[PDB]
Amino acid sequence: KMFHIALYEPEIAPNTGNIIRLCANNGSQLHLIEPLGFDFDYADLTNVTRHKNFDAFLKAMAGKRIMACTTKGSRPHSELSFAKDDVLLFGPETRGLPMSIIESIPTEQRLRIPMAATSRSLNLSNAVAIISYEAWRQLGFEGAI
Template identity: 50%
Template sequence: MPQKSRARRGSVSAIEIGFLALFHVVLYQPEIPPNTGNIIRLCANTGSSLHLIHPLGFDFDDKRLRRAGLDYREFADVRQHADFAVFLAEVAPPRQFAVSTRGAQRYDTVAYAAGDAFVFGPETRGLPQAMLDELPAEQRIRLPMCPGQRSLNLSNSVAVLLFEAWRQHGFSGGA
């Protein structure tokens, strides 16, 4: 039975609304709790599901994760999966996009569809090459950066991509 939430006035939890996400954000083996906390809050505010692929680099009850996510965890659809194959079997997204500095396609040139899954790698190493190789070039996307820079912060990258995808859908469900 779901725990009673400390919901803010006028808000409802993901459980109460029978959550059906427009997009799936997938964090493959995330390492830094505050990034994941920020992404929980982002997913709650955009109506997206968050999928955490084990092993995690932190305890899910880490105080830094709670602090970054504030009280948004109860408003977000957050699921944990033992590995990526389990995620694919349980969720079966119609399309998945690997987000990487090694991506072939710029993120803003893609037409996103409801149900798309955006897969992000661990903060210190990104997605394994084998995972990238599983997808066609047009589903390996990147965010442009100035030359000589290694990468963007994970939670910032998720926000940029998620808001572009949501914008393409007229910010469906947003106020």
């Protein structure tokens, strides 16, 4: 696997469906951190790991570098130096990551996607796509045909 995409308590089933397919496209593992806000190709499901809670997730990822998507004390995603086996952690669609999780992540590991003057947020699946494909670009798209 190139990267670990981690979704904290995701809300909207279609976004998670899109992210599962995206993870097959960039060669990444998806991690769903329960509780999920909806019910849970078969080859596309061999790339998904469910974790009972955030603590179980941390144990399973112990030793990996965790990047969090947040606008609090973050740089533009393209300014971080990504590496194989990085974890890319995303908050749910309507709330973002809780402060207790954001505070446990150093500011050097916080990333945001730049925005123009517009009040609308990006769809979560598109945000994962932009961040994971920027990270993959930095690794010369290792494993692509």
